[PDB]
Write a protein that binds this ligand. Structure first.
Ligand code: C5P
Ligand code: C5P
Ligand code: MN
Ligand code: MN
Ligand code: ZN
Ligand code: ZN
Length: 295
């Protein structure tokens, strides 16, 4: 878990390095994936030109940064297609919608065996609280693993937030861009250890796989997606949650949707609080301090 965050990045920008990277990823059970794309003038939904594809698997302690721009999409696809198409190797994503659209549109490939960890988290929230909101990476790492992320380089982040320039076109890439690019795939693989193969997780992995497959089918159609699967960008389709995860949950104490019994203020505020000694759990009439004859 802690070891994954210390994986160094290896830039893959030659045919020789690509063949070696493929060989490693071919022996994996799970591969975390992400993309860095050109920032657009529109700042649109559809990702710009693919610059990097980031990969980090369980087979080797390393983050591959595939320079798709240098290699070209044709070279990258020829060596990575069957790997991406192999359903026996799980492809991990954190919000896969735009990435899947980009892989379909720009690279001509639809990945198989996809698991979307953002959707996984929302599916847990649906099961327990009838909440269909998508949460950011920082929130999910905190909530699931207890970690607080460092946060990205601010000059890198400001350049992306401005969106007046491609940013990821420039070669060679400076180290603080390469480190920024490598960050999310480390976090994704780390999250999979907490969410996948864990009996305390109240949703089955196969159910989230099938829910993720609906996203992949919707977003990998060989062309730009006009109609979104979700009502707003920061939520998950409720009918899809109903179908693949089941009914939404709620508080077992007060009956309300939006929180669990462990978070319930009505439960905690409703407990007996001793007016004489202040302790929760008994009243003053049953207090041993106030009434030592009881002890
Ligand atoms: N405009 C938006 C707003 C949110 N989102 C998604 O919803 C998540 C939660 O965003 P908020 O932090 O705004 O709640 C983001 O991490 C992102 O995946 C999006 O993709 N587009
Ligand atoms: N943690 C929480 C959150 C909400 N609640 C209660 O649940 C009810 C409905 O919650 P919302 O206000 O989120 O809709 C309210 O009566 C609120 O006080 C609670 O008792 N504990
Ligand atoms: Mn992404
Ligand atoms: Mn990223
Ligand atoms: Zn409650
Ligand atoms: Zn007392």
């Amino acid at each position: 878990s802690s070891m994954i965050l210390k994986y160094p990045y290896r830039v893959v920008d030659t045919h020789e390095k690509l063949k070696e990277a493929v060989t490693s990823l071919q022996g994996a059970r799970s591969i975390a994936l992400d993309i860095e794309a050109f920032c657009t003038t529109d700042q649109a939904k559809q990702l710009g030109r693919i610059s990097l594809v980031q990969a980090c698997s369980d087979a080797k302690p390393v983050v591959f940064l595939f320079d798709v721009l240098t290699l070209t999409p044709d070279v990258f696809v020829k060596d990575m297609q069957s790997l991406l198409s192999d359903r026996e190797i799980r492809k991990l994503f954190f919000d896969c919608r735009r990435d899947v659209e980009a892989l379909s549109c720009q690279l001509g490939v639809k990945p198989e065996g996809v698991l979307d960890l953002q959707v996984f988290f929302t599916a847990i929230q649906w099961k327990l609280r009838s909440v269909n909101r998508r949460s950011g990476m920082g929130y999910v790492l905190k909530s699931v693993a207890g970690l607080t992320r460092q946060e990205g380089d601010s000059a890198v982040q400001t350049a992306m937030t401005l969106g007046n320039r491609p940013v990821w076109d420039i070669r060679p890439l400076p180290d603080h861009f390469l480190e920024y690019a490598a960050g999310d795939v480390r976090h994704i693989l780390l999250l999979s250890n907490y969410l996948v193969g864990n009996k305390d997780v109240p949703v089955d992995v196969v159910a989230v796989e099938r829910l993720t497959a609906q996203y992949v089918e919707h977003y990998a159609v060989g062309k730009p997606v006009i109609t979104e699967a979700d009502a707003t960008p920061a939520e998950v389709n409720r009918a899809w949650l109903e179908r693949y995860i089941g009914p939404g949950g709620g508080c077992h104490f007060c009956g309300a949707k939006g929180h669990t019994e462990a978070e319930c203020f009505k439960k905690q505020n409703g407990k007996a609080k001793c007016s004489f000694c202040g302790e929760v759990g008994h009243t003053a009439r049953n207090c041993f301090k106030k009434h030592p004859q009881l002890l």
